[PDB]
Amino acid sequence: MAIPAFHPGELNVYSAPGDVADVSRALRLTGRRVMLVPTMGALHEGHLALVRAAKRVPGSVVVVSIFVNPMQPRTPDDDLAQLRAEGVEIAFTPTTAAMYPDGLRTTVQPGPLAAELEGGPRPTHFAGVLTVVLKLLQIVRPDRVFFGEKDYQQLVLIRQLVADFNLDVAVVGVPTVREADGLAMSSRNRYLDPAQRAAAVALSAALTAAAHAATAGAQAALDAARAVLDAAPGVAVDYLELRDIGLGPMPLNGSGRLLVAARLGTTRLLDNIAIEIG
Amino acid sequence: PAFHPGELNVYSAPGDVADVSRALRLTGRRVMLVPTMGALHEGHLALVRAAKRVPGSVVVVSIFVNPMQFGAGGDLDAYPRTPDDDLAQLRAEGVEIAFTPTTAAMYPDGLRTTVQPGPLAAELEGGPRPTHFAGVLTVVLKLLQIVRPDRVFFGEKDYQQLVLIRQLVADFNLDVAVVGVPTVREADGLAMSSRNRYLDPAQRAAAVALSAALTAAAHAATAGAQAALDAARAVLDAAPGVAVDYLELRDIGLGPMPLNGSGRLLVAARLGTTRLLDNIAIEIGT
Ligand SMILES: COc1ccc2[nH]c(C(=O)NS(=O)(=O)c3ccc(C)cn3)cc2c1
Ligand SMILES: COc1ccc2[nH]c(C(=O)NS(=O)(=O)c3ccc(C)cn3)cc2c1
Ligand SMILES: COc1ccc2[nH]c(C(=O)NS(=O)(=O)c3ccc(C)cn3)cc2c1
C-alpha cells in the first residue's frame, strides 16, 4: 500500500518496475511533471544533453532508465555519479528478468520502415527497441520522453509507435551532441584508431556540406555528400539516403533528412542532418 | 466536449473520449471500459452491469467492428451491425459513455505498428487465422490507451482472447485491471453470442450440444481427463449436424504447461456455416 521511499533532491535508484511505477504515480499526483530519458547506460554527453533538456521543463522530475535490452558496455557506479551531478532524482535500473518476467511473449511489430536502412543488417532490431520503449512508457507514464536525433530512424519509429497506439506522451527529439570536429557522440568513437578517427569526420562533413549545397537542389546535396565520403579512406558506406522528415520518399522541395551509415574497420557509425531543398 | 451525467453521451472522436475520461479520472471517478464489437446481447450487458457495480464508476462502452481482426472472405461485411438497438440497450443500462469511433479515426495510417501476440495466438482459434489475435490485441491496446480505464471487462466466452489480453497487459506493463466475467447462457445452456442469430430452428436445437458436452465433461472429470473428454465427445457425436472443429482440454492459462488439477475445456463447432465457441472450467479428480 505504502509508496516506496522517495527523497526529493537526491538520486533515488529503483530496480523494481513496480516501485518506479508507484513513485512516478505519486509524484504526478503531487503535481510534478515526469520526464523520461531512456538509456542503455555507459552514459556520455549525448545522454546528458537529454537529461538537461528534461530538466528545463518547469516542475520536472527526471527519470533516467538504464537497461540493456537483450531483445534489440556497462559502468554502473560512474553512470549514477553522472546523474547525481546532473540533479536527476530517479534512476530506474531493472534486470532483464524484471523487464521480462514471462520471457519474450507479446511484442511490438513495427511497420515497414523498420525493415529499411538500419533494419537491413538488423531486421528485428527495431521490434526490440519499440517493445522496451513501450514498456518503459507504461511503467513510468511520463509526460514527455526524450530521445536524441542521433538515432533518427529510431526516433521516427517511436513517433509511429506513439501515434499508432494512441499513447499520450509527448516525444521530444534533442539535437545531436557532437565532438569539436562534428563527429556525432557515440560510445563507439573511442574504438577508432587515429586513422579511423580522422576519417570518421567525413560523415558529419558530408552531411553539413549537403545541407549547404541544398540551395542548388537535391542532387547537388547528395553529390556533395558522396564527394566528401569519397575523399575518406576506409569508410565503407552502407547507405546515403535523402528522405522526407518521416522517412518516406523525399518530396520535390521542402524539408527532408539526409542519413548516412558507414563501417570503419569493425565499427559502424551513423549520422543524419536536416535538409531544406532550394 | 460536453458530458452529461445520468445520460448516454456518445463520442466518435478518440480525442473527445480521451479528454472526457481523463477529466473524470481527475475528479475522482474510476473509469471502467467494456470493449465490444456491437450487436449487443445479454452477455455484453453482464459486462456493463459488472462495471457499474464498481463504486464511483463511470462506464465507457466502446462499439467498433475492428477491421484488423478479420481476413479477406466477406466476414467483415457480414458481421452483425445493430447500431440503434445497441445504443438503446446502453441507455436502458444507465451507461454514461459510448465510444463509437470510425475506422478512419482508429486507423488513419492503415496497418503500421501492430501488436505481435505470443505463441498462444497461433493455436486454437488462431491456427487457421494467423493475424486474428494480432488484430484483437492491437485494437484493445489502442482502446486502453485512448480511454485509460482503471478496469477493463471481458467475457469468459472468448476465453483464448481473454488469456491473450491478460498477456498483453502483463507483457506491456499496462496499468489496468482485467476483469473476466463468467459466460451468460440461454436457459438451455447455449452461450450468448452475436452469432446465435444465424442458427435456424433445427441448428438452434442442436446447438445445446456444446454446453451439454462441456457440462457433462466437467462432472465426468472426477474420473479423470479421458473420462471428461470422452463424455464431451459422446454428447457432440449424438448431436445432429454439429461438426466439431476442436475439443481440447488445456491448463487454465492455455500456455506451454501441462494440465494439473485445474483446466479449461474448449470447443469450437460448426452448425451449417455458423461457427460456435464455448468453454468451461474443469477440475480433475476430487
Ligand atoms: C542529444 O545528442 C545525443 C547524441 C548521441 C546519443 N546517443 C544516444 C544513445 O546512444 N542513447 S541509448 O544509450 O539509449 C541507445 C543505445 C543503442 C541504440 C541503438 C540506440 N540508443 C543518445 C544520444 C543523444
Ligand atoms: C459475460 O458473458 C458473456 C457471454 C458472451 C459474450 N460475448 C461477448 C462478446 O462478444 N464480446 S465482443 O463484442 O468484445 C467480441 C466479439 C467477437 C469476438 C470474436 C470476440 N469478442 C461478451 C460476452 C460476455
Ligand atoms: C501465412 O501465415 C502467416 C503467419 C504469420 C503472419 N504474420 C503476418 C503478418 O504479420 N502480416 S502483417 O504484418 O501485414 C499484419 C500484422 C498484424 C495484423 C493485424 C495484420 N497484418 C501474416 C502472416 C501470415
Residue type present at position A272: N
Task: State the closest ligand 1 atom to the C-alpha of A175, by its place in the atom list counted from 1.
Answer: 1
| B267 and B221 belong to one structural domain | yes
Burial pattern A174-187, b for ≥16 Cβ within 10 A else e, equals bebbeeeebbbbbe
What whole-number distance in Å separates Cα of residue A184 and Cα of residue A177?
Answer: 6
| A124 and A232 belong to one structural domain | no
Cell match 537542389: residue? A217
What whole-number distance in Å separates Cα of residue A20 and Cα of residue A16?
Answer: 7
| B4 and B100 belong to one structural domain | yes
Helix/strand number for chain B, H first, E second: 10, 10
What whole-number distance in Å separates Cα of residue A16 and Cα of residue B169?
Answer: 17
Q: Is A47 a catalytic residue?
A: yes
B181 touches chain A (CB under 8 A): no
CB B228, CB B221: distance < 8 Å? yes
Q: What does the CA dihedral A204, A210, A211, A214 come to, rounded to 10 degrees?
A: 180
B266 beta partners: B248, B279
CB A176, CB A150: distance < 8 Å? yes
| A31 and A133 belong to one structural domain | yes
SS3 B239: coil
Method for this entry? X-ray
| B237 and B152 belong to one structural domain | no
Sheet holding B177-181, edge to edge: B9-11, B97-99, B57-63, B30-36, B151-155, B177-181
- From atom 5 of ligand 3, which residue's Cα is the shortest distance away? B130
Of the residues A159, A175, A191, which one is the last residue of a structural domain?
A175
| Contact residues on chain B for A160, CB-CB shorter than 8 A | 109, 112-113
User: What range defines the domain where residue A88 resides?
Assistant: 1-175
User: How many Å is the Cα radius of gyration of chain A?
Assistant: 20
What whole-number distance in Å separates Cα of residue B57 and Cα of residue B24?
Answer: 10
CB B249, CB B225: distance < 8 Å? yes
| B188 and B177 belong to one structural domain | no
What whole-number distance in Å separates Cα of residue A126 and Cα of residue A108?
Answer: 9
State how far the alpha carbon of A263 is from the alpha carbons of A203, A206, A208, B60, in Å: 11, 15, 19, 53
| A155 and A46 belong to one structural domain | yes
**CATH number of the domain that residue A185 is part of:** 3.30.1300.10
Helix/strand number for chain A, H first, E second: 8, 10
A272 beta partners: A259
Torsions phi, psi of A258, nearest 5? Answer: -105, 125
CB A23, CB A4: distance < 8 Å? yes
Torsions phi, psi of B35, nearest 5? Answer: -85, 130
Cell match 485491471: residue? B177
Residue type present at position B102: T
B171 touches chain A (CB under 8 A): yes
State how far the alpha carbon of B286 is from the alpha carbons of A119, A221, B250, in Å: 55, 78, 18
| B6 and B145 belong to one structural domain | yes
What whole-number distance in Å separates Cα of residue B12 and Cα of residue B107?
Answer: 13
What is the distance in angstroms between the Cα of A160 and the nearest Cα belonging to chain B?
7
Give the number of residues written for chain A: 278
**CATH number of the domain that residue A147 is part of:** 3.40.50.620
Q: Please list, in sequence order, all residues whose beta carbon lies within 8 angstroms of the beta carbon of residue A190, skipping any fewer than 6 positions away.
A: none
What whole-number distance in Å separates Cα of residue B40 and Cα of residue B61?
Answer: 11
How are beta strands A236-244 and A254-264 bridged, if at all? Answer: antiparallel
A90 touches chain B (CB under 8 A): no
| A63 and A97 belong to one structural domain | yes
Q: What is the count of structural domains for chain B?
A: 2
What whole-number distance in Å separates Cα of residue B217 and Cα of residue A51?
Answer: 60
The three cell numbers of residue A92 are 530506474
State how far the alpha carbon of B219 is from the alpha carbons of B248, B269, B276, in Å: 16, 21, 22
Residue type present at position A256: G
| B208 and B139 belong to one structural domain | no
Task: State the closest ligand 3 atom to the C-alpha of B115, by its place in the atom list counted from 1.
Answer: 17
What whole-number distance in Å separates Cα of residue B51 and Cα of residue B49?
Answer: 5
B181 beta partners: B155
Residue type present at position B36: T
| A239 and A167 belong to one structural domain | no
Cell match 479520472: residue? B25
Of the residues B128, B155, B182, which one is the last residue of a structural domain?
B182
What whole-number distance in Å separates Cα of residue A180 and Cα of residue A223?
Answer: 25
Please give the resolution of this entry in Å, rounded to 1 decimal.
1.5
Cell match 506513439: residue? A162
Of the residues A175, A199, A230, which one is the last residue of a structural domain?
A175
Q: What DSSP character marks residue B251?
A: E
| A97 and A165 belong to one structural domain | yes
